Amino acid sequence: ANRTLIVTTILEEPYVMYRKSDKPLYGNDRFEGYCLDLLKELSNILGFIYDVKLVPDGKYGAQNDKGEWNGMVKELIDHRADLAVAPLTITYVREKVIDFSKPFMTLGISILYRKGTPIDSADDLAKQTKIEYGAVRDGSTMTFFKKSKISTYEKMWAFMSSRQQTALVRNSDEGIQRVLTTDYALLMESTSIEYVTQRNCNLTQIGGLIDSKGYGVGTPIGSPYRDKITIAILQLQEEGKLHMMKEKWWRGNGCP
Ligand SMILES: N[C@@H](C[C@]1(C(=O)O)C[C@H]2OCC[C@@H](O)[C@H]2O1)C(=O)O
């Protein structure tokens, strides 16, 4: 039999979540979400079974000054996992070190905050001095700011970095809690803003999308699975299955 593939992933609603049950759940059955449904589909098309393993350091992945990676990206570089199936952003810096499938979803960075402020854009947010802001540490949103040559975003990076231990949160849940309880706005991918703002009516998007990019399945460079995964993603795309999965996990509209 084909060796069981190791899948690295991360908890992120509604992609990967703990299933609620009154009885014990083991192995893959502990998890549900868009990315678990994606895995069920891809594995049917490619002919494998898999073992879902949450990334030990709880990070998506960024590189330090020494060029060392962490998170799911590191798991792939180091051949600890065969695939990363998660809301994993396809980026230039990552594509140089891992192989991504074609995208299965598109999105862009935007701002999550509470309601009732005059802040209407990143420019407004960077300029004002009442509300703090940040991003999840060691994800692509942090990296977008770190790498930006756009003045507003350079200032925003310098601010986030100056108070990093502070402004950069461990994960999206900590970020959302910080938005709800303190004067802090979270730079967040739009598909997650769409999800949370239809569930918590105290939350809102500020401004539009600041960029546009995709999520892809990650594999180590040279993986004999990447092309097969790409072909399967295109099948699911064209058959309307990715759209159906999005509707399933985001439905419906809960806030004015
Ligand atoms: N997709 C990103 C991870 C993350 C982000 O950096 O925006 C981290 C997390 O940030 C808040 C919600 C959603 O935007 C999540 O995306 C990555 O592949 O590095």
From Swiss-Prot:
The record's subcellular locations are: Cell membrane; Postsynaptic cell membrane
Q: What is this protein called?
A: Glutamate receptor ionotropic, kainate 1
Which residues are involved in binding L-glutamate?
A: 87, 89, 94, 140-141, 189
Q: Which residues are glycosylated?
A: 2, 202
Modification Phosphoserine, positions: 161
Organism per entry: Homo sapiens (Human)
Positions carrying Phosphothreonine: 197
Q: Which cysteines are joined by disulfide bonds?
A: 201-255
What's its job? Ionotropic glutamate receptor that functions as a cation-permeable ligand-gated ion channel, gated by L-glutamate and the glutamatergic agonist kainic acid. L-glutamate acts as an excitatory neurotransmitter at many synapses in the central nervous system. Binding of the excitatory neurotransmitter L-glutamate induces a conformation change, leading to the opening of the cation channel, and thereby converts the chemical signal to an electrical impulse. The receptor then desensitizes rapidly and enters a transient inactive state, characterized by the presence of bound agonist.
On subunit structure and binding partners, the annotation says: Homotetramer or heterotetramer of pore-forming glutamate receptor subunits. Tetramers may be formed by the dimerization of dimers. Can form functional heteromeric receptors with GRIK5. Can form functional heteromeric receptors with GRIK4. Interacts with KLHL17.
Q: What else is known?
A: The postsynaptic actions of Glu are mediated by a variety of receptors that are named according to their selective agonists. This receptor binds domoate > kainate > L-glutamate = quisqualate > CNQX = DNQX > AMPA > dihydrokainate > NMDA.
Family named by the database record: Belongs to the glutamate-gated ion channel (TC 1.A.10.1) family. GRIK1 subfamily.
Q: Which residue ranges are assigned to the Extracellular compartment in the record's topology?
A: 118-256
